[PDB]
Amino acid sequence: EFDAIKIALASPDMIRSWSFGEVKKPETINYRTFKPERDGLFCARIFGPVKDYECLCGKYKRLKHRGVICEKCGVEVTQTKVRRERMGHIELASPTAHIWFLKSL
Amino acid sequence: VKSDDVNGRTKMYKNIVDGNHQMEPGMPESFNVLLKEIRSLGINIELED
Amino acid sequence: PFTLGQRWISDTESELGLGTVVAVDARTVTLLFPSTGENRLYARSDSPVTRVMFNPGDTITSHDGWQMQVEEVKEENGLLTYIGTRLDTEESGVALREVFLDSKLVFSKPQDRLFAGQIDRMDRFALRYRARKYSSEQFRMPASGLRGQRTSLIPHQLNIAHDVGRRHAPRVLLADEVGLGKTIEAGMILHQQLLSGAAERVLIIVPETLQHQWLVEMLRRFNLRFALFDDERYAEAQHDAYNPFDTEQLVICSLDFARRSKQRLEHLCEAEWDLLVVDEAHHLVWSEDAPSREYQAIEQLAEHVPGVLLLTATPEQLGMESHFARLRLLDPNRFHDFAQFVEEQKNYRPVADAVAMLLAGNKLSNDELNMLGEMIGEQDIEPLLQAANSDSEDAQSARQELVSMLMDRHGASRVLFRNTRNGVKGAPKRELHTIKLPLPTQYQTAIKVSGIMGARKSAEDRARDMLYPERIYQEFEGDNATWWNFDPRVEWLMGYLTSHRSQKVLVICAKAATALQLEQVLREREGIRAAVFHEGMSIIERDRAAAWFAEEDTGAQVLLCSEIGSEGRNFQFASHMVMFDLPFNPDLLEQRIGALDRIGQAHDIQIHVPYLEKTAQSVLVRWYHEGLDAFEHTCPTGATIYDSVYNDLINYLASPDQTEGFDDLIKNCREQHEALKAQLEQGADRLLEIHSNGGEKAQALAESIEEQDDDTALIAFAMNLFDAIGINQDDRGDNMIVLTPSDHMLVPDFPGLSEDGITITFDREVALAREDAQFITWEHPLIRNGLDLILSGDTGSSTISLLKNKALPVGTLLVELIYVVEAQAPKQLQLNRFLPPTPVRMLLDKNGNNLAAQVEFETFNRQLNAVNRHTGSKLVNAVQQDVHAILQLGEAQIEKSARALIDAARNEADEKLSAELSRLEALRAVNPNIRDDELTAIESNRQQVMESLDQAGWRLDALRLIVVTH
Amino acid sequence: MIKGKQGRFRQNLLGKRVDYSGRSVITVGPYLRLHQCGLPKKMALELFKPFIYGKLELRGLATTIKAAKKMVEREEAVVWDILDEVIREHPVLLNRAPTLHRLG
Amino acid sequence: GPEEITADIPNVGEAALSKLDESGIVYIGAEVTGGDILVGKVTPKGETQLTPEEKLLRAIFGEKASDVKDSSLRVPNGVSGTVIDVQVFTRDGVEKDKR
Ligand SMILES: Nc1ncnc2c1ncn2[C@@H]1O[C@H](COP(=O)(O)OP(=O)(O)O)[C@@H](O)[C@H]1O
Ligand SMILES: [Zn+2]
Structure with missing residues (x-):
């Protein structure tokens, strides 16, 4: 279902269009619980639910409110595999050069 | 469907045991992984027709 | 194709009614169900919704409730608007924006699948129907079933489970004596509410030790977990969320943690829980002069939790x-003045004879009838009293309702709950042993000069000081004086445990330092390993000690517990006890003894207590053993008995030289104790515990529930569901089967399974023996997940089945219709107990005649066998137009049936709500301290729920074709 | 990620351990036609295993899949018949080691 | 925790344990075949998983009689054989078991 392929330099709006939300905090886990800190590097609402068909708040459970963004934790209810493709983006404070086009040699 | 596609592997096994001989038409997920890899870089790498 | 104003139906959640498209986003959509009034933010992707279609010529109703006849539909900007002819006035050309439709759906019939060439196989309809039949009953089952626990069935346990677990916003005093099992009963309540869905957010505050026990027990038996919020978890939940606690659902948190800061208490308060669990509620220090900070904090919790469970030993x-005060917390309107409960008990001293005579089936003298009328403050008595007195046709339930009313003006027998062990079968034995020892002269020298300024202490304080002669000896002879060297107690207990080297023993002292030094002595001198429980041990250390002492197979031989160490830990494996320092006040020693007097004892408890001669120990032993006999027995009357001779008793203790006139005091105390016991057993109690156990009728009810648990249908249904899923099953033989994922599982990952597999047993008793394996039930999460998966699996329903009846005409068509009767309302209105989605089975021949009631589904089911695919569907649907006609008959023949099904739960709601209102008004008239606006509001809610339940409807969920060959 | 052997460009070229594979030493096959490859029993009951499952559960000899697995591993005589049925016409691909030609 | 060579193994029929010894090692001269357990070996059920409630469980210790995953070494598929000898080797400080 895929004719010829196209490659081009990505516009910033294109990049932000390749995301549901923006990461804003470097964090991995609680180190006490499995807490995916809000706006963390593995943020639940930017990437998906850590466990299949669940909300981090735990309100909904495993099929009933499928594909629901939990009003409290703000997370879709879908399979953990959805985490595999949901891209994110970090907004840069200042414009920053892309090395690849700087050093194509 | 016989190297890495877990979903394809399972679907094909279902079809074989169910008595249906049929692959599932669709781009292998390896293409999707590569596409997201490129999109990590600021490259459009879009599809076409 | 989403747009503002559209109406959609949720796929899985058909119970929310029609949803309005409030707003859309690039990847999200905010919908609202006005019948439930609930907003839901769905992801635009994955489409967990559906746009039900009113085809031209169908009929619709606007929110105002006037029907119409749709004739055209137009679409603009991906938004649909209808045009139709009214049915009330037959006005054509009436246009409706779809936003103004009803808020609850009575449509989305599946016949379009049949008329569009879409059908399924026979193994997609029977399972659906039976799952629906099992699931609908859950909301009106015998408490949705109460077999989903790893507990040995006990009459009062299951009676309490059934009673409390089927009541909105329960609030009771679970005060069963120590070790009878109150954590288990409370877990039954919690699990029942959770399974019913009536409660989802709960609170659990327990002492420091009880946290781990509660958590592990509930997970191991009820498969329930409640997150524990320490300082770190609470702090990080703050550092993320505005309200930290509310992210989770069920919680463990100590009142120590809770009362640390006022804002923390406010955050706990504003979390909108459903049920509150408080363990050992006796600690709550109420005082009209000055209530404690902990007490008023828990009072705020009670103010902001609809449900509360008071557990006190x-x-x-x-x-x-x-x-x-605790009852006043449970019911301030009822328990408003303290001086009335005693009069109530004195008045109920003889009253049990009335209920005894009534239960005998004999007539009641009208003189006693106008005393039963005196007890209950109502004037609607005569209509019920005459019907029940003559044993009318309604007497089987009218008598039950009458005694319920008598309870209600007795105190409901519900805010209070007790279970004894005398009449309650199941007490192994409590043997007592006493040993007298010579008092060493060192403590004599210490205590002779102990009193110089010590008179500043009160007699209570003097007895408290005498509770630790070792510590006063240290005080006189420098701290850590060699007190343990000249102790006949040390040698006595050394010999005692020398007798019991191959056995475990629970030794308990009065403080942490005592336990420390005693463990030092035992380990260093005799090399006897003893697991201490001093306060210097963190909760993790307490758990470690409990575990080592619990490893009966090569575990700690001795468990040394300080005063606080006498917590609710289960030491049923330990059948022997030792009282080291002979604690002063009774009820503390009662709790200590009850630490072992629990279920699962290897043998009866025998208690040993070495006491030195000529000291307060002898006086206390004699008094407890003879004056009240509080050791061997469990008669709960010491509260004021101790107070009555309190001053003289403490004077005797603080002045052991005073011994004249003590036997007569003991005799009078025993006279009072036996007279009080006779008064209590005659009435004012001992029928409350009968209600707690519910009598042999409740025993038979529990037995029926246990036989239901013994039903083997679940085993076959779940096994075949697993086989359809593709879950590998391997049996061990001892009612143990391991389930594991397989290469051919329908989903890559399932919630309740892992790569290692899990063992399960369907038997209660084996599960009790083997805590490893889960107790699979309709209540177990795995079965619930599978049931919801199949229910949400809208694929199926349609079938192509063959029936081999050589003596029935060929080509005969039988349609099996499974409709659903549903009502829409918020979860907080708890329609589950009144009207859930309910299946309706119909069996129609060509002429639309009903055969559902003439033959049951199961016996019918063996005959069916599916036959060839789509060629068959075409061949049989060559005359499929008749199905469109069949509905007009089937509906016409089942719509009335739906009415017959609709007429029922109205009584269920009306009777109980009216009874609660009657009790409220009867109590209010006596006590003018109630807010009339609240009762106006609950009357309004009564009207609301009645009228809403009067609204209903039935929809089609499944249809099966059956053709009879030869 | 886009470079080296683990580079996800040159990944489906290095080589894939395909399933339903096999191997053996070779033996002459007179009495065969010119479109028949004598395949062993012990290797044809581990290649067409899922096909056997399908034709077995469908025939009802063992409806549940785990029963079908335990039947094939039990060498029950019926499984030989079912395997013969499935391999009635189900071409196999025989590939020599260096596949220079397109006939290889 | 350590790996256990006990004969006790979950999710295995009595047929497998029929020829083993109590320790978990097959007897000499046992006409093994494909799939039979030569040595009964097991591992202690994975690692720290689930949630901090799982850490709570570890603090309280789990509640599993089995509490061990099956990792027994069986005959490789497709080879018969008659066991001649079974040597046992022990790290110093490990008490020798029954076999
Ligand atoms: N039905 C039962 N089945 C198994 N164990 C029980 C049952 N009832 C009570 N127990 C045991 O009794 C112990 C005490 O119960 P709990 O209510 O926590 O304290 P108490 O009974 O002293 O109030 C529990 O640890 C539990 O193991
Ligand atoms: Zn959520």
């Missing part, structure tokens, strides 16, 4: 006022 140790 000592309802009366703090005197009568604390008990009244």
